[PDB]
Write an enzyme that holds these catalytic residues in place. Structure first.
Site, PDB file in Angstrom:
ATOM      1  N   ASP A  32       0.813  -1.208   0.000  1.00 56.43           N
ATOM      2  CA  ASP A  32       0.000   0.000   0.000  1.00 56.43           C
ATOM      3  C   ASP A  32       0.869   1.291   0.000  1.00 56.43           C
ATOM      4  OD1 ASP A  32      -2.014  -1.990   0.251  1.00 56.43           O
ATOM      5  OD2 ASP A  32      -2.555  -1.460   2.319  1.00 56.43           O
ATOM      6  N   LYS A 116     -27.834 -11.146  -2.183  1.00 49.63           N
ATOM      7  CA  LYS A 116     -28.662  -9.950  -2.220  1.00 49.63           C
ATOM      8  C   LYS A 116     -28.068  -9.022  -1.190  1.00 49.63           C
ATOM      9  CE  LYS A 116     -32.941  -7.525  -1.510  1.00 49.63           C
ATOM     10  NZ  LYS A 116     -32.029  -6.476  -0.936  1.00 49.63           N
ATOM     11  N   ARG A 137     -31.211   5.099  -7.839  1.00 53.07           N
ATOM     12  CA  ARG A 137     -32.308   4.433  -8.525  1.00 53.07           C
ATOM     13  C   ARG A 137     -33.570   5.289  -8.445  1.00 53.07           C
ATOM     14  NH1 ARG A 137     -36.606   1.127  -7.451  1.00 53.07           N
ATOM     15  NH2 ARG A 137     -37.299  -0.037  -9.298  1.00 53.07           N
TER      16      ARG A 137
HETATM   17  C1  D41 Z   1     -32.893  -8.285 -11.625  1.00 49.61           C
HETATM   18  C2  D41 Z   1     -32.196  -6.916 -11.582  1.00 49.61           C
HETATM   19  C3  D41 Z   1     -33.216  -5.846 -11.992  1.00 49.61           C
HETATM   20  C4  D41 Z   1     -31.090  -6.932 -12.645  1.00 49.61           C
HETATM   21  C5  D41 Z   1     -31.577  -6.653 -10.181  1.00 49.61           C
HETATM   22  N1  D41 Z   1     -32.028  -5.594  -9.504  1.00 49.61           N
HETATM   23  C6  D41 Z   1     -31.499  -5.386  -8.283  1.00 49.61           C
HETATM   24  C7  D41 Z   1     -32.055  -4.184  -7.646  1.00 49.61           C
HETATM   25  C8  D41 Z   1     -31.858  -3.486  -6.465  1.00 49.61           C
HETATM   26  C9  D41 Z   1     -32.731  -2.385  -6.470  1.00 49.61           C
HETATM   27  C10 D41 Z   1     -33.390  -2.394  -7.662  1.00 49.61           C
HETATM   28  N2  D41 Z   1     -32.991  -3.483  -8.365  1.00 49.61           N
HETATM   29  C11 D41 Z   1     -30.485  -6.252  -7.749  1.00 49.61           C
HETATM   30  C12 D41 Z   1     -29.846  -6.097  -6.496  1.00 49.61           C
HETATM   31  C13 D41 Z   1     -28.914  -7.013  -6.080  1.00 49.61           C
HETATM   32  C14 D41 Z   1     -28.247  -6.868  -4.744  1.00 49.61           C
HETATM   33  N3  D41 Z   1     -28.886  -6.203  -3.783  1.00 49.61           N
HETATM   34  O1  D41 Z   1     -27.131  -7.375  -4.559  1.00 49.61           O
HETATM   35  C15 D41 Z   1     -28.564  -8.115  -7.041  1.00 49.61           C
HETATM   36  N4  D41 Z   1     -27.656  -9.029  -6.680  1.00 49.61           N
HETATM   37  N5  D41 Z   1     -29.157  -8.251  -8.222  1.00 49.61           N
HETATM   38  C16 D41 Z   1     -30.098  -7.330  -8.585  1.00 49.61           C
HETATM   39  N6  D41 Z   1     -30.645  -7.532  -9.820  1.00 49.61           N
HETATM   40  C1  IWH Z   2      -1.712   4.638   2.456  1.00 44.27           C
HETATM   41  C2  IWH Z   2      -2.634   3.680   1.736  1.00 44.27           C
HETATM   42  C3  IWH Z   2      -2.697   3.654   0.355  1.00 44.27           C
HETATM   43  C4  IWH Z   2      -3.516   2.761  -0.308  1.00 44.27           C
HETATM   44  C5  IWH Z   2      -4.306   1.858   0.397  1.00 44.27           C
HETATM   45  C6  IWH Z   2      -5.105   0.796  -0.320  1.00 44.27           C
HETATM   46  N1  IWH Z   2      -4.787   0.653  -1.758  1.00 44.27           N
HETATM   47  C7  IWH Z   2      -3.732  -0.141  -2.147  1.00 44.27           C
HETATM   48  C8  IWH Z   2      -3.386  -0.295  -3.455  1.00 44.27           C
HETATM   49  C9  IWH Z   2      -2.259  -1.226  -3.763  1.00 44.27           C
HETATM   50  N2  IWH Z   2      -1.701  -1.942  -2.790  1.00 44.27           N
HETATM   51  O1  IWH Z   2      -1.840  -1.315  -4.929  1.00 44.27           O
HETATM   52  C10 IWH Z   2      -4.167   0.399  -4.426  1.00 44.27           C
HETATM   53  C11 IWH Z   2      -5.210   1.171  -4.062  1.00 44.27           C
HETATM   54  C12 IWH Z   2      -5.575   1.348  -2.686  1.00 44.27           C
HETATM   55  O2  IWH Z   2      -6.487   2.077  -2.297  1.00 44.27           O
HETATM   56  C13 IWH Z   2      -4.288   1.887   1.803  1.00 44.27           C
HETATM   57  C14 IWH Z   2      -5.163   0.986   2.633  1.00 44.27           C
HETATM   58  C15 IWH Z   2      -3.439   2.793   2.438  1.00 44.27           C
END
Ligand code: D41
Ligand code: IWH
Ligand code: D41
Ligand code: IWH
Lengths: 317, 317
Positions: A32, A116, A137
């Protein structure tokens, strides 16, 4: 050619690739301190020569001035919501309903299963590889301009990692705060008598609604992309998992726990494996999103509009 | 008390009740000539004494002047759409999905089955018994002011038939043109070289979009109420069929082919009985709308937003 423009281009390239290796791959090639060494060597050089300072440089994530308010953006393609299940029987019902509705059900029916995430849904536009705008959204049709806030997320690339980016690409993902950052944020808000958030979803929701991006930059927010919106100047893959793998290959962060499954019995294995893992993941999830992996079958099955769960139009042939 | 105000009140009462008997009950007590006799006796008397002319009199259905354009009305309660099935197996899947999702499934599960009329969805507001405004469904959130057009529908009452009407009642129904009127409308448009409509749904859709209500009055449009929106100053019945019976009792036209059914096997009898009847009904239908009859179980099951048919969030307990 100038010596300074050669140094900035080489530094920016190295840093954008080191961010990609740490954020997207969880496999950095340098410590880092090496990353920061090149980072503040670039920032110093960009201020000594302001003429070569670019809008999408990794040093320009935060805006120095807080914004007046939040504009209104309406989604070109509307942002769809999700239907939900609560039991193995209810999930198997949704699956049989799809097996009986299809013109041709293949053997096997592949599903792209993901966790999710308990975060906020956002849109991010990439015009010829550059991040031009980001929106919440909102209602699924109209949201807020949170570009300044979205630019502060360390794992959101300000430039796509490809020499042939699409004309326009709208990445769609879930913005959330992991557990460690959440624990840290409350303890700091306690020792400086300020607002404490009840859970990581409220902490992320509030951080994204801050008008000053200097405050949002200090909040440990993280993007995980779940889909694509606008897609111009590109032929996207025929399956959902391949599109997600494609996003990752051009610089976009996706969830690493996403796996394919063939049929409801395998899909229910993933639901319970992710359920045991819930207690030791590092971020909040409130279930799993189970999707039809083929894009042909998605367009075939289609989408429901704002409608009841207690009324069905059994249409005539 | 005056002699003229006594004659107008008595004529208006008789005519609104004769319209109710012909339109809503299909059981008039007088010939169509007796109805017209009192109608033009009232109209003549209202023009001889304009001071006692009321806004909601049965003679005042049509506006003499065509309107400038169409205003924009946004629905207080949004107007919901419908999910659809195409096979006995797909309907039975939607039913099992509800049996497994309920906290307590009763024995038996009553359904209010109606025909799916091939018309246009509209809103009609009744402020203290009077028709103050009507709107198209539009997108389900925002529609057009088609009050002048809706006032011309002969079976749409300009005043509710009750001495204790609610403060505000939004009737929601399907506006359509029956077969006979449709056949007549094309033959008249042929013998006067004007637009012919491909089917009764396009004929009704076009008639409701006319700016001049003198044109809409000549189109044989018909309302059949399917539900209620706003309901202030009233305690509505606990079931869907009782609410529809209630609308009919206060002057609103509903479909006469609506029947209750207990369980999917009985509900599929209604789908095929209505399917045989389709060929000799007098208006177009493209299926059946099958609804959960209890309003407690509706609020319990709830509604889906704009979402895919190929994605489900199996949520954790
Ligand atoms: C099916 C569609 C419409 C592509 C969709 N929608 C959501 C989402 C979250 C809020 C509105 N839509 C979503 C949200 C998540 C989630 N919360 O990780 C997910 N893994 N997949 C999602 N896929
Ligand atoms: C001081 C400092 C700089 C960067 C980071 C984290 N990090 C590391 C890299 C890396 N290793 O290539 C790239 C982007 C980034 O955000 C931390 C936690 C602390
Ligand atoms: C379930 C809900 C929302 C009360 C509803 N909606 C419609 C409808 C038509 C257009 C939008 N919604 C409908 C339309 C009809 C119809 N076309 O006869 C019907 N019989 N019932 C309907 N029920
Ligand atoms: C001349 C004329 C007048 C009325 C009607 C139809 N009709 C009849 C009654 C009625 N019988 O109580 C009430 C209202 C109405 O619209 C027709 C077809 C022709």
């Amino acid at each position: 050619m100038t010596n300074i423009q050669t140094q900035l281009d080489n530094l920016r390239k190295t840093l954008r690739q080191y961010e990609y290796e740490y954020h997207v791959l969880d496999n950095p090639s340098v410590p880092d301190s090496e990353y920061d060494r090149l980072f503040h060597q670039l920032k110093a050089l960009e201020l000594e020569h302001p003429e070569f300072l670019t809008s999408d440089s990794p040093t320009q994530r935060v805006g120095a001035k807080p914004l007046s308010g939040f504009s209104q953006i309406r989604h070109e393609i509307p942002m769809l919501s999700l239907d939900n299940a609560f039991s193995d029987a209810e999930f198997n019902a949704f699956v049989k309903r799809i097996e009986d509705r299809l013109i041709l059900l293949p053997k096997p029916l592949t599903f792209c299963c993901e966790p999710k995430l308990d975060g906020l849904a956002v849109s991010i536009l990439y015009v010829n590889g550059e991040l031009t705008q980001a929106a919440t959204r909102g209602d699924g049709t109209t949201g807020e301009d949170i570009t300044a806030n979205i630019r502060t997320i360390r794992n959101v690339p300000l430039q796509l990692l490809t020499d042939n980016p699409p004309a326009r690409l709208e990445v769609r993902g879930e913005v959330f705060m992991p557990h460690a950052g959440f624990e840290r944020l409350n303890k700091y808000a306690l020792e400086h008598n300020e607002k404490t958030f009840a859970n990581p979803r409220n902490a992320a929701a509030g951080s994204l609604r801050q008008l000053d991006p200097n405050i949002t930059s200090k909040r440990p927010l993280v993007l995980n992309a779940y889909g694509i919106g606008i897609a111009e100047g590109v032929d996207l893959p025929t399956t959902h998992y391949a599109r997600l793998q494609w996003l990752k290959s051009i610089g976009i962060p996706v969830n690493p726990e996403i796996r394919l499954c063939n049929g409801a019995d395998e899909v229910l294995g993933f639901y319970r494996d992710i359920q045991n893992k819930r207690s030791s993941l590092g971020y909040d999830i409130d279930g799993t999103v189970l999707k039809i992996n083929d894009i042909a079958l998605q367009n075939e099955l289609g989408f429901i509009s704002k409608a009841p769960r207690w009324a069905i139009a059994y249409k005539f042939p």
